[PDB]
Amino acid sequence: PSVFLFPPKPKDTLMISRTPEVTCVVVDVSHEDPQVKFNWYVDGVQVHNAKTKPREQQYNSTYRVVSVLTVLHQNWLDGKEYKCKVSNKALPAPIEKTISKAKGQPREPQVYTLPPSREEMTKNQVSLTCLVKGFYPSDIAVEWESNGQPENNYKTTPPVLDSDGSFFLYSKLTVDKSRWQQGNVFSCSVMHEALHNHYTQKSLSLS
Amino acid sequence: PSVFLFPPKPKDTLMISRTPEVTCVVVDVSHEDPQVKFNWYVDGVQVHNAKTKPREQQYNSTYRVVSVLTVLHQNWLDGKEYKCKVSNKALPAPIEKTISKAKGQPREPQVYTLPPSREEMTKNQVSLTCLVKGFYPSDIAVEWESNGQPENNYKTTPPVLDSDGSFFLYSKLTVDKSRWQQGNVFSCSVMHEALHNHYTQKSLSL
Ligand SMILES: *[C@@H]1O[C@H](CO[C@H]2O[C@@H](C)[C@@H](O)[C@@H](O)[C@@H]2O)[C@@H](O[C@@H]2O[C@H](CO)[C@@H](O[C@@H]3O[C@H](CO[C@H]4O[C@H](CO)[C@@H](O)[C@H](O)[C@@H]4O)[C@@H](O)[C@H](O[C@@H]4O[C@H](CO)[C@@H](O)[C@H](O)[C@@H]4O)[C@@H]3O)[C@H](O)[C@H]2NC(C)=O)[C@H](O)[C@H]1NC(C)=O
Ligand SMILES: *[C@@H]1O[C@H](CO[C@H]2O[C@@H](C)[C@@H](O)[C@@H](O)[C@@H]2O)[C@@H](O[C@@H]2O[C@H](CO)[C@@H](O[C@@H]3O[C@H](CO[C@H]4O[C@H](CO)[C@@H](O)[C@H](O)[C@@H]4O)[C@@H](O)[C@H](O[C@H]4O[C@H](CO)[C@@H](O)[C@H](O)[C@@H]4O)[C@@H]3O)[C@H](O)[C@H]2NC(C)=O)[C@H](O)[C@H]1NC(C)=O
Secondary structure: OOEEEEOOOHHHOOOOOOOOEEEEEEEOOOOOOOEEEEEEEEEEEEOOOOOOOOOOOOOOOOOOEEEEEEEOOOHHHOOEOOOOOEOOOOOOOOOOEEEOOOOOOOOOEEEEEEOOHHHHHHEEEEEEEEEEEEOOOOOOOEEEEEOEEEEEEEEEOEEEEOOOOOOEEEEEEEEEEHHHHHOOOOEEEEOOOOOOOOEEEEEEEOO | OOOEEEOOHHHHOOOOOOOOOEEEEEEEEEEOOOEEEEEEEEEEEEEOOOOOOEEEEEEEOOEEEEEEEOOOHHHHHHOOOEEEEEEEEOOOOEEEEOOOOOOOOOOEEEEEEEEOOOOHHHEEEEEEEEEEEEEOOOOOOOEEEEEOEOOEEEEEEEOOOOOOOOOOEEEEEEHHHHHHHHHEEEEEEOOOOOHHHEEEEEEEOO
């Protein structure tokens, strides 16, 4: 039996309207003794069944069970630990897994847009670059937009640990060379806890 | 008694002068029964040996044995498969692991240098950006230099799959703003199999 603990999506902890959740998944549960017991704790507290919510599901020759715990935005941002305890009779001792926001002081992300290289202009599609650096923790959300509509032909690298101990990443938005020199304006949105309203936006366009 | 096969460093296989190698790591070796016997095969052949060489041990609470096999640059680029057979008494049957370079038409990387944003011109240090996209397979090596000398403060993101099936990455070199204002020339070096001579350079300066 193996247990996996997943943190909330970065974007869920940053918007009050969204529902951030910590997901505890157990696999290789005995096909013979599928009864699984879950206990959740926040900073060591609440053996006593609280919120949470399990389900179940049969697989190869085993069972898979998932429990989801809704977390409070500020609880997560304040570094509270979420512990998932899993018990099964076909197991010696219960399996424990804990997860929290990475420790350290939040650092505000620096966002800069970079137009495509002149040499790339011979191509039919160009690259609009958004650089995000100096941020911490690594949890972050980046998106693009031209008008109000979201742009979807973009790719973002995973965050990279930098020398100062902070993280950086780049996002690449690909558009038709025409849409660019025509004058259209683009912008990458960046969501991070260390930003004023957990959100900033930088514009990009030729001139 | 777990086995992990690793491929050669991208750079080692692109320059004849270097020595590319495939490495077969063996973790959780029983403190009781180390004695690990390796077996390597290149496209099936070998075992009556040809160039293997294991070494060292011990770790946290268990042993870690590692076998290194030197490869012919050409054999690795041609897509030959490398197989590591690991044997140990405390292991029922011999665990085998195969490895080879990603398959598919190699694609030439486009290299573009991007100057620091006007907005960043306010910090003491600035970011020189090297965008490398459209390449395949993902094995690539990127480096920065200035007037013939290698730069120290740069970081390269790992390869990211692009929408069209090829890869891209960004390399970032941080330098004192003065060095950029003084007009010094900085260069992004890229090493990939689909480039003529497996190498290309792109310069940046104010
Ligand atoms: C004794 O210590 C061993 C290693 O100890 C080091 O690493 C940590 C354990 C540290 O806490 C500290 O103890 C030491 O610094 C333990 O063995 C480890 O076992 C795991 C899985 O059993 C291996 O994980 C693999 O890692 C490779 C990547 O390796 C490279 O990167 C790491 C760092 O990121 C380096 O340390 C390595 O040298 C390599 O450069 C993965 O590619 C590999 O693939 C995955 O396999 C798992 C299956 O387990 C899949 O689920 C995934 O999808 C992937 O396919 C795998 O993740 C560690 O490499 C290995 N440690 C090393 C480096 O040899 C050992 O467990 C511990 N006690 C025991 C149990 O004896
Ligand atoms: C029996 O069947 C189980 C479920 O079957 C899945 O597999 C395929 C082949 C079909 O059989 C389908 O029915 C079904 O998709 C198998 O369970 C699997 O067990 C592995 C562990 O051995 C789990 O892997 C873990 O995944 C984590 C990420 O999960 C998320 O993403 C995957 C897609 O990539 C989704 O499916 C999940 O739902 C999640 O959204 C990953 O974080 C874990 O990695 C971490 O831990 C390892 C150590 O184990 C470490 O090396 C690594 O660095 C990380 O720290 C880990 O890889 C897998 O999730 C689970 N399958 C599913 C769908 O939940 C079971 O193995 C199979 N056979 C046996 C012997 O039981």
